[PDB]
Amino acid sequence: QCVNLTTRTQLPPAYTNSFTRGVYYPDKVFRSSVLHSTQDLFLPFFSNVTWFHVISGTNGTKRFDNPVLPFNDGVYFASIEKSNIIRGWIFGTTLDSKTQSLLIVNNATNVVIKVCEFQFCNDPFLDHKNNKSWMESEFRVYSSANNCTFEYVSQPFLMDLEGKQGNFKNLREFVFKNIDGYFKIYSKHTPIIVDLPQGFSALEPLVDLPIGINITRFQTLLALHRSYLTPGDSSSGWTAGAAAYYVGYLQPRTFLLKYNENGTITDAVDCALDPLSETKCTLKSFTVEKGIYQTSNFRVQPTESIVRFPNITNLCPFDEVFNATRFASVYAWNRKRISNCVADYSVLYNLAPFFTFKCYGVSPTKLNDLCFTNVYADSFVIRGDEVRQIAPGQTGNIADYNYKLPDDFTGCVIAWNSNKLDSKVSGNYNYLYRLFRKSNLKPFERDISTEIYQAGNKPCNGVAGFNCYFPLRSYSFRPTYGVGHQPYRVVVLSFELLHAPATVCGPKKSTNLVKNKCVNFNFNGLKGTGVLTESNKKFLPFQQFGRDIADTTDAVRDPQTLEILDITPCSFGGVSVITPGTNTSNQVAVLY
């Protein structure tokens, strides 16, 4: 079972500087005498950490020395002590028993790792009586056995393999991170130091396990020291002792690792920290000669994001296009017009299970955000084995004689099965097709004619005798037959892009327009970055967005207010660093 914890104490978060600490080997490969440049999670150089301290000894107050700490993207848990007290890291857990809770409790008979899906308690603390054997008799971290997933034991881990000295024997360093789904742990042991000491060191990887859960915040743990000397409460009645540990949060950074003749890391420089840095990186060397160097460019990043769309809310009539009781023949393919309405393509997904919504020139998922012009809708009935035959530039009977598509076709087709709708008891023969025509028809062209032609010379002129075969042939469409010869229903949605007269698109909500600020904009599917400013250029009443000497837009008309604005990159330039050398000084001057 578990018992609550009391006697909470609030102390200021003492901070201290970490002088180039927390650099490890990124990958499990061997290199030597190379100035390799990496890009991974690292603790930034010269940053302050939250120096926790175990104070209020004896049994006075003992402090709340194990609070909850946020776990955003990494942790650099360090420690300096002699009695080997700080243990038991609880990281990546929501603390509300939402999912798996992670425990690493060691320095027992042997190092063990406990992983179970238990329901967490209200206040955790790991008991250790001051008897001959220090055993965790009470499990106050958890009090449920709902589920358990993983167990693991490791012989070599965290042992203070050293002698007996009064100075601080070990300086443990840890790095906790999730590699996009699984947790990786690094560690190293540092000898005595006569409060992070200055120097450079590298961390050797260790065991990693998948787990994979939501992460809320990190919680530490301390070994209890309950003794019969003092009568205390069950929540907190143990002696404090003395300990100290540090916490730092990792961030994405770019480093320049230097390897030695043993293949070991000996030095590293943190880019994007100082002006002399990042040019020590552009030169790709640790020594910089005097002169002028060009490092990179400086740009003002946008701070907001706005969208503007036409303020129409009429729904497009996609029902009767797809819910039509009777379609028409293939050679009479019933052209339609759709305009001045809001089109939602999510409702289109509800159709027959046999569905072939494949599209050219636009992804099937990104129909909502774009804004089109004069969307069409073309419905007809076609044989089952000809659904693949209708395609841009595909030869064949139905394509070259009945329905021809353009080569640069924009839009796509929708095909769903009509097993029972278009098949009668004895079959349906209303639908016809043109088996024979004079020649191939032009794209998006309709011709309907039933006059008998001189198929084999000697024109019949209505005789319809021998060598004269009728142009229009019907369909059998048996109630039950092969899927290849079973009626299908197809509709093509052709729309014209280049977005000059934007008319329909979908459900995008407008935002208040902001000017004189480096901001994003989405003016009717025209995403870009810049500053919006009132324009004195005179647009004619029929004039939409303008252009410049290049093909880049320079002005755009407000779809709602009907006003003309200007767009322009907000800032950019070059940066040069003036340095007098590396052996003589470490200060530079920056020329913008």
């Binding site: 636009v362 992804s363 990104k366 955000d369 599917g525 290049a550």
Partner: protein, 50 residues
């Protein structure tokens, strides 16, 4: 000439990055983006050579 050579499609869907990224999913947008990048790199190299 270097400025004017920025509007060439290079046998792609469009000559602007944002439209291509908005109108296509990454699996097929990768080919168009690669085509544009290599075309503009070849356009830039010749100016340096001259």
């Amino acid at each position: 000439t270097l400025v004017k050579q920025l509007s060439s499609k290079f046998g792609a869907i469009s000559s602007v990055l944002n439209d291509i990224f908005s109108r296509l999913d990454p699996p097929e947008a990768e080919v168009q983006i690669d085509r544009l990048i290599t075309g503009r790199l070849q356009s830039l190299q010749t100016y340096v050579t001259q």
